[PDB]
Amino acid sequence: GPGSMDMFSAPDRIPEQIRIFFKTMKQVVPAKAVCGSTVLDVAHKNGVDLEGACEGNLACSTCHVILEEPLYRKLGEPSDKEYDLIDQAFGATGTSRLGCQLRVDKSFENAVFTVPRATKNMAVDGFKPKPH
Numbered sequence: 857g858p859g860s861m862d863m864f865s866a867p868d869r870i871p872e873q874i875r876i877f878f879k880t881m882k883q884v885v886p887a888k889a890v891c892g893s894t895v896l897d898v899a900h901k902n903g904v905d906l907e908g909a910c911e912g913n914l915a916c917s918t919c920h921v922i923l924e925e926p927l928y929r930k931l932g933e934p935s936d937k938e939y940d941l942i943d944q945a946f947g948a949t950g951t952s953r954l955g956c957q958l959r960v961d962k963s964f965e966n967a968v969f970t971v972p973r974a975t976k977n978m979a980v981d982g983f984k985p986k987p988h
């Protein structure tokens with residue numbers, strides 16, 4: 857019975873828990889990552905003001921945050937498109953752009969999440985008749 861059984865459809869199986877770090881423009885604070893939780897969900901408990909708190913709302917332009925050099929490297933790198941896109945920015949690293957949905961795993965051990973961008977707040981809007 858030569859079989860592989862390597863791949864599985866049970867991603868819910870989260871490994872041991874780890875600890876992460878929340879770095880902001882003001883300072884960096886410690887964060888605890890528990891199996892079954894999420895980074896964005898952690899920042900809420902620790903108090904870190906992580907950009908998000910949205911569940912498919914309309915207030916969403918683009919998601920781009922800075923992540924650990926190595927953590928992001930192994931986590932995955934951008935493609936040609938994202939390469940030139942970010943390459944156009946001033947001293948912009950591919951680790952500055954990412955999605956908006958991650959889980960807590962062993963690979964997140966000592967993971968550093970740098971949030972250079974600011975959080976959403978009271979701000980007028982409507983001055984966009986013909987946005988290029």
Ligand code: FES
Nearest residue numbers: 908910916919956
């Ligand atoms: S969750 Fe709203 S832009 Fe990322």
